[PDB]
Design a binder for this molecule. Structure first.
Ligand SMILES: CC[C@H](C)[C@H](N)C(=O)O
Length: 344
């Protein structure tokens, strides 16, 4: 009979866009897998859970998944939501594969049932720093973040890499997620003649910062991580998004072999351009490879760590703590278009 797989992410709230990408990828992977026969004739079925990328709700969802008897979780997306949920999953023998959480701490605590189909900010942060030091070469930098594990973690990593390269960081400070009035920020950037800003956070905040900065006549060059590289950023900022530098996973939707998946998704009037469509599809493929060997969570995790799995992201390989080996974030130019081109 049917095999239940929880797909957990932000299906509502300020960053619902992340959940949209996730579900789109999950839905297509499950349809593709079941069309080919499922797991030895057994069909896979997705059970959608909304954690709104809110830590307290992610904890409620984790407990509900356990109580619903589901043993495999594709998900949770935000780092600060994924980590407390992983504590429950590890304690309850539930396999958890996140297609989007990037904070290093998630996998630095000895957990055996946690894996990822995305990279680490201990790689994403230095990639940004290096690019700024080698290609951008700005004169007066400011680093802003939203005080959350993800954003503040990247902000600190970039600050450390810039300090190490003798860059002039004029200020480092956080703002509150949810904030829409960035007038004092814009004024400080203007007053202190800041030509470059790295923002560690998500698209709702980045979008407003960009609009207001441009409305105030600022020519400052901004840069942000993959949490900012999506169509919702472009919809919020409009023309203020052109010029934005971002670090993000490769454009898997442009890999020729993936075209059928792209066409199938477009065919449903869904967006196949978001990175989490692909990291999530890949997570389902990883779960598929393991379910073909065993239905036990620890055996699946052990199997995946000992064997590569071919996916829409290419062949994935994991280390003993559950991280992808050799994953790389690229640096791109984002456009009001909602598209990304490799930065020079
Ligand atoms: C959707 C994931 C977000 C963008 C970020 N990578 C995090 O770990 O919170």
């Amino acid at each position: 009979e049917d095999i239940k797989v929880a797909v957990v992410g932000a299906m509502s709230g300020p960053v619902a866009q992340y959940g949209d990408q996730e579900f789109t990828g999950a839905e297509q992977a499950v349809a593709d897998i079941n069309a080919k026969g499922g797991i030895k004739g057994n069909k896979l079925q997705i059970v959608k859970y909304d954690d709104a990328c809110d830590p307290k709700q992610a904890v409620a969802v984790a407990n509900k998944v356990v109580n619903d008897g589901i043993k495999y979780v594709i998900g949770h997306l935000c780092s600060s939501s994924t980590q407390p949920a992983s504590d429950i999953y590890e304690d309850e023998g539930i396999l958890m594969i996140t297609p989007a959480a990037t904070a290093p701490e998630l996998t630095a605590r000895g957990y055996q049932l946690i894996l990822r189909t995305t990279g680490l900010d201990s790689d994403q942060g230095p990639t940004a720093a290096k690019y700024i030091l080698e290609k951008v070469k700005p004169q007066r930098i400011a680093i802003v973040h939203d005080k959350q594990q993800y954003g503040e973690g990247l902000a600190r990593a970039v600050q450390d890499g810039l300090k190490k390269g003798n860059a002039n960081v004029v200020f480092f400070d956080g703002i509150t997620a949810g904030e829409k009035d960035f007038s004092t920020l814009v004024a400080r950037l203007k007053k202190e003649n800041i030509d470059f800003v790295y923002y560690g956070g998500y698209h709702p905040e980045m979008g407003q910062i960009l609009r207001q900065a441009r409305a105030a006549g600022l020519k400052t060059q901004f840069m942000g991580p993959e949490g900012v590289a999506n169509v919702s950023l472009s919809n919020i900022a409009g023309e203020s998004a052109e010029g934005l530098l971002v670090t993000k996973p490769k454009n898997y939707d442009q890999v020729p072999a993936n075209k059928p998946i792209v066409d199938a998704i477009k065919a449903k009037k869904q967006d196949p351009s978001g990175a989490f469509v692909w990291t999530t599809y890949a997570a389902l493929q990883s779960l598929q490879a393991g379910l073909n060997q065993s239905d036990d969570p620890a055996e699946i995790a052990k199997y995946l760590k000992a064997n590569s799995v071919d996916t829409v992201m290419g062949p994935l390989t994991w280390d003993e703590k559950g991280d992808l080996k050799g994953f790389e974030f690229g640096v791109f130019d984002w456009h009001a278009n909602g598209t990304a081109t490799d930065a020079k």
